[PDB]
Amino acid sequence: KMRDRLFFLLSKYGIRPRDSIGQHFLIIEDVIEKAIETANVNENDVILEVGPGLGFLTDELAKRAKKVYTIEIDQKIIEILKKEYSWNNVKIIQGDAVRVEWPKFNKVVSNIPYKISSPFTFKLLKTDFERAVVMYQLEFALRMVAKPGSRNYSRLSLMAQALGNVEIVMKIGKGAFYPRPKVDSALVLIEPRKDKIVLNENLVKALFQHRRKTVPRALKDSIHSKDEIRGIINNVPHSNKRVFQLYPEEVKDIEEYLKKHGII
Ligand SMILES: Nc1ncnc2c1ncn2[C@@H]1O[C@H](CSCC[C@H](N)C(=O)O)[C@@H](O)[C@H]1O
Ligand SMILES: NC(=[NH2+])NCCC[C@H](N)C(=O)O
Ligand SMILES: O=S([O-])[O-]
Ligand SMILES: [Zn+2]
Ligand SMILES: [Zn+2]
């Protein structure tokens, strides 16, 4: 009946899905149910969806939340959402989710298009927010929940996990969308830590440039300074590890070491 509803709307509004903006519409009702459940949506919450699509998940958010802001790049979809839904509590915002100014919000419950998985996520992590539930292409969600010491551990993994408990909650097959995509998706929960770990971005970029290296060699080789600081390198914390083996905590030990020696 969500599948039936979808094909109803396709013909009705003569919709031509654009894969260039990742137009794969969700049509399994349980995935909406899970997302809502996981986000524990309530009558006080101000939600931020990206890419409302045919507005299925938006419709479910809107009837549970105080307010919903949703950011749609496709102006035609926006013309449809307005004519099909009667949302008293949804503000629709035309533009690129990455480019436009975000309004204030305490939870995210959205699909995240493939081509903005990385910018969106980094933008979200720079934000004050109580809970995110965001569906990603499966590789990217696997990267986000990679643990220190796996190959797919990277800057994203670190920067995410420094801010929140990051876990995959269900895996969603490609049969769950129309058009059918090339890849599976995952629903990811992000819970802000009380114990937030905040790290110098430039240092992280530096370390993770060649992340398969030792912390000392990675530092030696990442003078963004003065090369004449070999003295400090040998006493660097966590010198036995390689960068891809570091937790946010050990990265902070390295940061605080370099501040103490006025390298930052
Ligand atoms: N950069 C971007 N900013 C905002 N919306 C975007 C976008 N790139 C794609 N979109 C929109 O995001 C949606 C992704 S596919 C549809 C989402 C899915 N039906 C859902 O459960 O919400 C499409 O509506 C697409 O037009
Ligand atoms: N498998 C887990 N969910 N473990 C971590 C705790 C997450 C839990 N949903 C919370 O709200 O804190
Ligand atoms: O394909 S969008 O323009 O409805
Ligand atoms: Zn359920
Ligand atoms: Zn150590």
Side-chain angles (χ1 to χ4, degrees), residues 30 33-34 37:
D30 307 300
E33 242 106 76
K34 192 57 157 211
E37 288 174 356

mmCIF file of all heavy atoms in Angstrom, residues 30 33-34 37, ligand 4:
data_model
loop_
_atom_site.group_PDB
_atom_site.id
_atom_site.type_symbol
_atom_site.label_atom_id
_atom_site.label_comp_id
_atom_site.label_asym_id
_atom_site.label_seq_id
_atom_site.Cartn_x
_atom_site.Cartn_y
_atom_site.Cartn_z
ATOM 1 N N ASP A 30 8.118 -0.398 7.056
ATOM 2 C CA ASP A 30 8.731 -0.784 8.329
ATOM 3 C C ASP A 30 9.976 0.051 8.618
ATOM 4 O O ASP A 30 10.341 0.254 9.773
ATOM 5 C CB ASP A 30 9.229 -2.238 8.396
ATOM 6 C CG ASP A 30 8.244 -3.339 8.026
ATOM 7 O OD1 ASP A 30 7.180 -3.449 8.685
ATOM 8 O OD2 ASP A 30 8.571 -4.113 7.097
ATOM 9 N N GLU A 33 8.892 3.101 10.153
ATOM 10 C CA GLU A 33 8.524 2.773 11.519
ATOM 11 C C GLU A 33 9.791 2.708 12.377
ATOM 12 O O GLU A 33 9.826 3.278 13.463
ATOM 13 C CB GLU A 33 7.674 1.491 11.564
ATOM 14 C CG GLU A 33 6.251 1.669 12.118
ATOM 15 C CD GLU A 33 5.065 1.634 11.155
ATOM 16 O OE1 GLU A 33 4.674 0.512 10.710
ATOM 17 O OE2 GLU A 33 4.491 2.724 10.871
ATOM 18 N N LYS A 34 10.847 2.050 11.881
ATOM 19 C CA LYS A 34 12.049 1.855 12.671
ATOM 20 C C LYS A 34 12.675 3.199 12.994
ATOM 21 O O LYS A 34 13.031 3.461 14.143
ATOM 22 C CB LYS A 34 13.116 1.038 11.938
ATOM 23 C CG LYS A 34 14.267 0.564 12.821
ATOM 24 C CD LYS A 34 13.749 -0.261 13.979
ATOM 25 C CE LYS A 34 14.737 -1.231 14.599
ATOM 26 N NZ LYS A 34 14.017 -2.427 15.128
ATOM 27 N N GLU A 37 10.823 5.148 15.569
ATOM 28 C CA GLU A 37 11.053 4.455 16.838
ATOM 29 C C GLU A 37 12.428 4.803 17.396
ATOM 30 O O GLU A 37 12.572 5.156 18.559
ATOM 31 C CB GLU A 37 10.982 2.927 16.689
ATOM 32 C CG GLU A 37 9.567 2.419 16.477
ATOM 33 C CD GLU A 37 9.380 0.943 16.184
ATOM 34 O OE1 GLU A 37 10.403 0.240 16.048
ATOM 35 O OE2 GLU A 37 8.189 0.507 16.104
HETATM 36 ZN ZN ZN B 4 8.461 -1.188 15.046
#
